[PDB]
């Protein structure tokens, strides 16, 4: 049995529609986003050990609120794809229960072993972050190059996996016109992308950096103005996808 390492899990209403999402926050991430609102999910050796059986006992207590009309499970974190074998196993069991599955990922896939395709076969929706198309900025914002994530986005397109692209809009970092055009260009031909969703930067989770004795590097940065969200949305819309925030 594969052992999973989790930060926590929670049931919460879906953003829209009926039903609930049971979200497991996986422990461990290898990106370093300056904005991360879950800074305590980074350590790969932390969290709580769980089995798929353990986690399904929690999931099924919400069965009546997860249906085709809305609701399901989400693998988030942290970075769930670092535990691809466990998430594959979990989603396989969710499918046996008829539950919709969603992978919330940074796409930082460094090895293409068989487990990736197996996980995707039992994933109904991938919410992929594309954090910055400009790799010079991406390296300063996230600590790593965007190359692997971009290749994974192309892989998902090749496999026709249903995808929502998520773009966190941070003043001074990801609110500029050029970066928005680059994102529009890159995703234009990906017919598997149902929508691009802009997430406005928020300062929530600062306290988690302070607990760890680490400075929060976006002190003083405010959320983007509505005008900025509308401008980025308009730029992206020129490339043909549905765009929302």
Q: Taking CB under 6 A as the rule, does residue 129 contact ligand SAM?
A: yes
Report d(CA 70, CA 177) in Å as an integer. 35
**Which residues here bind Cl ion, judged by CB under 5 A?**
29-30, 79, 108
Report d(CA 205, CA 194) in Å as an integer. 29
129 is in an annotated binding site: yes
Q: Taking CB under 6 A as the rule, does residue 29 contact ligand SAM?
A: yes
Of 216, 196, 193, whose CA–CA distance to 205 is shortest?
Answer: 216
Q: Taking CB under 6 A as the rule, does residue 40 contact ligand SAM?
A: no
Cβ 132 vs Cβ 183: under 8 Å: no
- Residue 42 or 71 having the CB closest to ligand SAM: 42
Is 169 strand, coil or helix? strand
What residue 89 binds from Cl ion, K ion, ligand SF4, none (CB within 5 to 8 A, per partner kind)? none
Region near K ion per CB under 5 A, out of 12-20, 64-72, 121-129, 172-180: 121-129
Position of tokens 């370093």? 32
For ligand SAM, which residue of 24, 74, 83, 105 counts as binding (CB under 6 A)? 105
Cβ 217 vs Cβ 203: under 8 Å: no
Annotated binding-site residues for S-adenosyl-L-methionine read 35-37, 78, 129-131, 202
Annotation: binding site for [4Fe-4S] cluster: 29, 33, 36
């Amino acid at each position: 049995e594969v052992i999973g390492r989790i930060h926590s899990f929670e049931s919460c209403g879906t953003v829209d529609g009926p039903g609930i999402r049971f979200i497991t926050f996986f422990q461990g991430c290898l990106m370093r986003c300056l904005y991360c609102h879950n800074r305590d999910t980074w350590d790969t050796h932390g969290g709580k050990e769980v089995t798929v059986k353990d986690l399904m006992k929690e999931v099924v207590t919400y069965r009546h609120f997860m249906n085709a009309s809305g609701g399901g499970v989400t693998a988030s974190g942290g970075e769930a794809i670092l535990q691809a074998e466990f998430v594959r196993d979990w989603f396989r069991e969710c499918k046996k229960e008829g539950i919709h599955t969603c992978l919330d990922t940074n796409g930082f896939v460094r090895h293409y072993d068989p487990v990736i395709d197996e996980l995707l076969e039992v994933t109904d929706l991938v919410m992929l972050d594309l954090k910055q198309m400009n790799d010079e900025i991406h390296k300063n914002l996230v600590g790593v190059s965007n190359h692997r994530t971009l290749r994974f986005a192309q892989y998902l397109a090749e496999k026709n996996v249903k995808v929502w692209i998520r773009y966190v809009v941070v003043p001074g970092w990801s609110d500029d016109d050029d970066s928005a055009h680059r994102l529009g260009e890159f995703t234009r031909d990906m017919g598997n992308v149902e929508k691009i969703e802009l997430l406005p930067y928020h300062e929530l989770g600062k306290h988690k950096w302070v607990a760890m004795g680490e400075e929060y590097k976006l002190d003083g940065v405010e959320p983007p103005r509505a005008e900025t969200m509308r401008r980025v949305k308009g730029i992206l819309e020129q490339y043909g996808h549905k765009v929302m925030f």
